[PDB]
Amino acid sequence: KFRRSGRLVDLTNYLLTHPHELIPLTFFSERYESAKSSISEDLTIIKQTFEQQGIGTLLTVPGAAGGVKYIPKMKQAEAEEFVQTLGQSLANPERILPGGYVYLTDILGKPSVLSKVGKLFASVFAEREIDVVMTVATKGIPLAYAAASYLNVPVVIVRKDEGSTVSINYVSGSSNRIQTMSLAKRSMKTGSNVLIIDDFMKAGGTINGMINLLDEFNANVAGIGVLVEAEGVDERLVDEYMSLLTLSTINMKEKSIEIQNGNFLRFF
Amino acid sequence: KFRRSGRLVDLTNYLLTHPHELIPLTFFSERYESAKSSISEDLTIIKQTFEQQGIGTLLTVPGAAGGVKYIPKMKQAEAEEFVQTLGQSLANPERILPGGYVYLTDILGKPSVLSKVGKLFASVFAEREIDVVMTVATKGIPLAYAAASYLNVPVVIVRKDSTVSINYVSGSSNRIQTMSLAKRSMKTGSNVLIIDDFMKAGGTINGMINLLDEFNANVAGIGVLVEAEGVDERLVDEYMSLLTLSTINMKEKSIEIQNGNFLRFFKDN
Ligand SMILES: O=P(O)(O)OC[C@H]1C[C@H](OP(=O)(O)OP(=O)(O)O)[C@@H](O)[C@H]1O
Ligand SMILES: O=P(O)(O)OC[C@H]1C[C@H](OP(=O)(O)OP(=O)(O)O)[C@@H](O)[C@H]1O
């Protein structure tokens, strides 16, 4: 039958494991063998706690098609504190790599770090219509998956090497050599709304390549998120995008590195 | 502060997002401004609900400096059901391609699937000592992360391109490849859960195991989503598989999928 206590625990779990899914009140009412109106009072308690604790919000549709949807959201204050902490650990001279690159590998491997970044991306882009999260192998993948797990959409990975395939030449900052990115035609429907995620935007050719690839699929750019941007990305290369951090100054020989907030506050 | 109701909700959230961490009772007492004995009653309700709903195990560690640890677990019944359903999705004729053969890419990218497989892997290897999850680029990276997030460990991604390199041969290829890992990317002595999406002939996983030897690392376990039939002498190291793939077109427009060996990992010797 479920006591009120067990009901709150189970509902909390159920909502948290089914983010961005509209769940009919009748599903819970049958699950708990309780009246829908009692479920709604339970949802009011979870909503309040979710909001007070910075977990997210519950959106409800009343009436005959009645249902509830859990939206992961991050409060501005948590976002700023988290990005600040991340930037401070990035501001380490030992992470400087040749070519104005920054060592992110340890950071991109940690579960706690990834889930906060994923959540921040899902929070900012929560209201966009997004069908799919896309990135290019290899380093962006963890970020793209983390974001996708909160938005509850597929992650699509563009390859650097099946079935029929769409291909796009592009240049990345790591070599003036022309590279090719490709995605199988079945990997994505025409007209998909696509969130592009990546770890580091240096000169913007990679994200621009992904934008050109979507153009071939007749898919739409719903949004763009990167963990770190270098200063001075050509605006023609990349449209609107959100960055968490800015690599504002780097110098291998001086072994000097400076990092600032990205533009993420514009999105709050 | 918190009414008790909000406390049950927040606590549930906190445990779920902090799997495989010992959380001292004092942490919760201070967080909710409530007595430890009141928190213990809440945790008893969560523990009982977590078990009945197949969410996992809430472990109590007794003592003045004790607390609780939430362990994600999946019941055998759900694992069996999940693997059957997944196997049936895999058998869809529309996944047959000329050449390579079976399109698995959407499955490897779907969060509902990834969350389930990750939890299954985490539940089976829950009691092993695991410092890190390891995989090779590219398609199975999300899977590695899903498993790692329930186990609460970092993921290390081996690259196909000081750095440690070893040669090996791939089942979906006909040439010697190289896999590599920076020494600064993984600690020596680590206990390692290797995760792989599709094991053909076993060269990749054996490459990984060889790599681990250069770091004096231990193979704590191996999980693969799908294995091809015909691992004769297989590979030196036991692994768990969910599904087995064979005859990729007989009669016409058909694919043969069977359950893997995962059930061995749910029973006692
Ligand atoms: O000048 P740009 O086009 O901005 O190039 C920046 C690179 C860096 C990043 O590394 P990954 O490709 O994620 O990782 P790896 O190259 O190691 O696979 C990739 O996504 C490109 O965006
Ligand atoms: O077991 P083997 O005999 O080595 O052959 C199977 C290979 C193929 C597969 O490559 P992926 O990394 O999944 O392919 P991609 O790089 O396209 O993701 C990987 O899982 C290896 O197990």
Swiss-Prot record, chain A:
Region (Effector binding domain): 73-268
A Pfam entry, by short name: PuR_N
Record keywords, A-Z: DNA-binding, Repressor, Transcription, Transcription regulation
Sequence segments annotated as region (DNA binding domain): 1-72
Superkingdom classification of source: Bacteria
Effect of residue 101 to A: Decreases interaction with ppGpp
CDD domains in the cross-refs: PRTases_typeI (cd06223)
Binding site for 5-phospho-alpha-D-ribose 1-diphosphate: 137-139, 159, 198-200, 202-203, 206
Binding site for guanosine 3',5'-bis(diphosphate): 101, 173-174, 202, 204-206
UniProt cross-references to InterPro entries, sorted A to Z: PRibTrfase_dom (IPR000836), PRTase-like (IPR029057), Pur/Pyrimidine_PRTase (IPR050118), PuR_N (IPR015265), PurR_Bsub (IPR010078), WH-like_DNA-bd_sf (IPR036388), WH_DNA-bd_sf (IPR036390)
One GO term (biological process): negative regulation of DNA-templated transcription
Cysteine pairs bridged by disulfides in the record: none
Subunit structure: Homodimer.
Protein task: DNA-binding transcriptional repressor that controls the expression of a number of genes involved in the synthesis, metabolism and transport of purines. In response to a signal of excess adenine, represses the transcription of the pur operon, which encodes enzymes of the purine biosynthetic pathway. It also represses the expression of the purA and purR genes. In addition, controls the expression of several other genes or operons, which encode enzymes or transporters playing a role in purine nucleotide metabolism.
Domain notes from UniProt: Contains an N-terminal DNA-binding winged helix-turn-helix domain and a C-terminal regulatory domain (or effector binding domain) resembling phosphoribosyltransferase (PRT) domain. However, the PRT domain lacks enzymatic activity and serves a purely regulatory role by binding effector molecules. The ppGpp binding site partially overlaps the PRPP binding site. Binding of ppGpp significantly alters the electrostatics of the effector binding domain by creating a positively charged channel different from the apo protein.
Entry protein name: Purine biosynthesis transcriptional repressor PurR
Native source species: Bacillus subtilis (strain 168)
